[PDB]
């Protein structure tokens, strides 16, 4: 690959410079090159990978939503331009999701390693299928929804067995799986029930956490609570 001649340590250093420069496409390319060295990622490295691609895909999802809205407001009756441009953005978004899903399958998702790492990557797999599901139609969408559910469910099973209710990876997975239920799977009752259980069981354990831990967990609990506010 394009990063094949660069030292792993140098790719991680350049990913952090890219993040400081808000150059997220560069950050993602450096992190992909580091993953392709075939060594495990540290906790910090996983977060760099996640930040890089979340920012790339985030800009494409926001663009697709702007163009989709303009497209739907002009479908009350025109010209092909809004549809053509929305299709172009959609194909780019799909390209990024396919890149991430390929890295997860080829390099990162293993039977071994700590629960936190396994949950982190299966959650990412569910997230990137969820993004494909947002733009998919027909048979393809049904296949993608099944893939998303299967990755999220596998991560939920591990997180419930191996991590405490306030673990931020466990919380973030439950938040995202609840959004999957609500917005993709059209199961609002499952979305609400999951969010409420996650929030309540975390609330019971807060007194046990250190300063840094308390911050990380309550940030995610506030998002759970905001969705419950919106949904109920």
């Amino acid at each position: 690959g394009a990063m094949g001649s660069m030292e792993r340590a140098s790719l991680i250093q350049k990913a952090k410079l890219a993040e400081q420069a808000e150059r997220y496409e560069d950050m993602a390319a450096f992190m992909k090159g580091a993953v392709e060295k075939g060594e495990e990622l540290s906790c910090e490295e996983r977060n760099l990978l996640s930040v890089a691609y979340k920012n790339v895909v985030g800009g494409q999802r926001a663009a697709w939503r702007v163009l989709s809205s303009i497209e739907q407001k002009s479908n009350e009756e025109k010209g092909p331009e809004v549809r053509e441009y929305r299709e172009k953005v959609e194909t780019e978004l799909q390209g990024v999701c396919d890149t991430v899903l390929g890295l997860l399958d080829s390099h990162l998702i293993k039977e071994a390693g700590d629960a936190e790492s396994r949950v982190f990557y299966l959650k990412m797999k569910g997230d990137y299928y969820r993004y494909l599901a947002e733009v998919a139609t027909g048979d393809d969408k049904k296949r993608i929804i099944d893939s998303a559910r299967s990755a999220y469910q596998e991560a939920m099973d591990i997180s419930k067995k191996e991590m405490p209710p306030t673990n931020p990876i466990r919380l973030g997975l439950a938040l995202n799986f609840s959004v999957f239920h609500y917005e993709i799977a059209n199961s609002p009752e499952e979305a609400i029930s999951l969010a409420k259980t996650t929030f309540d069981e975390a609330m019971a354990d807060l007194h046990t956490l250190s300063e840094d831990s308390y911050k990380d967990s309550t940030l995610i609990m506030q998002l759970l609570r905001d969705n419950l506010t919106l949904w109920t």
């Binding site: 996640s50 979340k54 920012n55 990380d216 940030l219 969705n227």
Partner: peptide, 11 residues
């Protein structure tokens, strides 16, 4: 819209 996780969950 619905809130989902940040890219960074810890740190």
């Amino acid at each position: 819209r619905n809130a989902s996780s940040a890219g960074r969950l810890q740190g």
